Amino acid sequence: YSDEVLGATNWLKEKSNQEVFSFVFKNENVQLNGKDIGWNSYKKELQEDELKSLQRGAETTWDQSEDMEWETTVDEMTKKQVFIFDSLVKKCLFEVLNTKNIFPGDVNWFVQHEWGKDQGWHCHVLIGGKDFSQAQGKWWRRQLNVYWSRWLVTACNVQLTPAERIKLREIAEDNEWVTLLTYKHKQTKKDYTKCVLFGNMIAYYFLTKKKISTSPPRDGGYFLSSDSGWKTNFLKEGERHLVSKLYT
């Protein structure tokens, strides 16, 4: 019952029933003129001050949440790429908030990077607040995907021609490398945005995942998480499970 665990539990419980959007930021493998662009082909560290700051935050989140009782053999390239993506994902969120003149304190968000059995690296984002309504989901997904595709093409470490860069930009947009949770529906039919309950989804699902500590990563594991209150960021796997237990 450290103050950090109690604080995280209380912060989530107060937001147990807050409706929020659920997004996934992802990438997919691309080959352009024989050039292979994989999940970790986005390793430029762009020298924009905000991005640099966000990347430092990811690094320090990793460092503080690391359990040294146990060895961690995650590849250095994998960590670097995840830190970069954390910065890029957040840059996208913050760009859209600016478009809507949303003061950051009026938003609650949670980010968790995971490795899926089939899709590999992806990043879950929950985000919402008083300035949000369900009907805005589609617009949010589209805007986020604009920024995500733009940043990915800027961060790509593969030497690309201009035609290749443009093609990559259009693939990331057309193939929806940012997804939005909707209710299940028929392909033809309307797709309704499905809000999730912030605190509950975090405590009863995201905090239940196993921490990735190897390369290759364990399927279904998490790399790194953070939230707008800096509440869960530094928690080790064991502490995360204590939060779920106390939350219940």
Q: Return the residue of 215, 221, 229, 244 that touches Na ion, per CB under 5 A.
A: 215
**Distance between CA 248 and CA 245 in Å, rounded?**
5
Closest residue to Na ion: CB criterion: 215
Measured from the Cβ of residue 70, the count of other Cβ atoms closer than 10 Å reads 10
Residues 104-133 that bind Na ion (CB under 5 A): 111
Does the annotation flag 114 for ligand binding?
Answer: yes
3-state SS, residue 36: strand
By the rule CB under 5 A, 86 interacts with Na ion:
yes
Only one of the segments 9-17, 44-52, 156-164, 187-195 lies at the binding site for Na ion (rule: CB under 5 A); that segment is: 44-52
Q: Does 45 bind Na ion (CB under 5 A)?
A: yes
Q: What residue type is 224 in one-letter code?
A: L
For residue 115, the surrounding DSSP H or E stretch is strand 107-116
Q: 3-14 and 237-247 are packed helices; what angle lies between their axes, rounded to 10 degrees? A: 50
66 in a labelled binding site:
no
Nearest distance in Å: CB 110, Na ion = 9
232 binds Na ion (CB under 5 A): no
241 is in an annotated binding site: no
Taking each helix axis from N to C terminus, what angle separates 76-99 and 49-65, rounded to the nearest 10 degrees? 130
Segment interacting with Na ion, rule: CB under 5 A, options 31-39, 79-87, 183-191, 194-202: 79-87
Tokens coding 40? 């970790």
Is 42 an active-site residue?
no
HSE (side-chain half, CA atoms, 13 Å) at 183: 7
Residues that bind Na ion (CB under 5 A): 45-46, 75, 78, 84, 86, 111, 155, 215, 224, 226
Which residues belong to the active site?
A: 205
- Known binding-site residues for a divalent metal cation equal 114, 122, 124
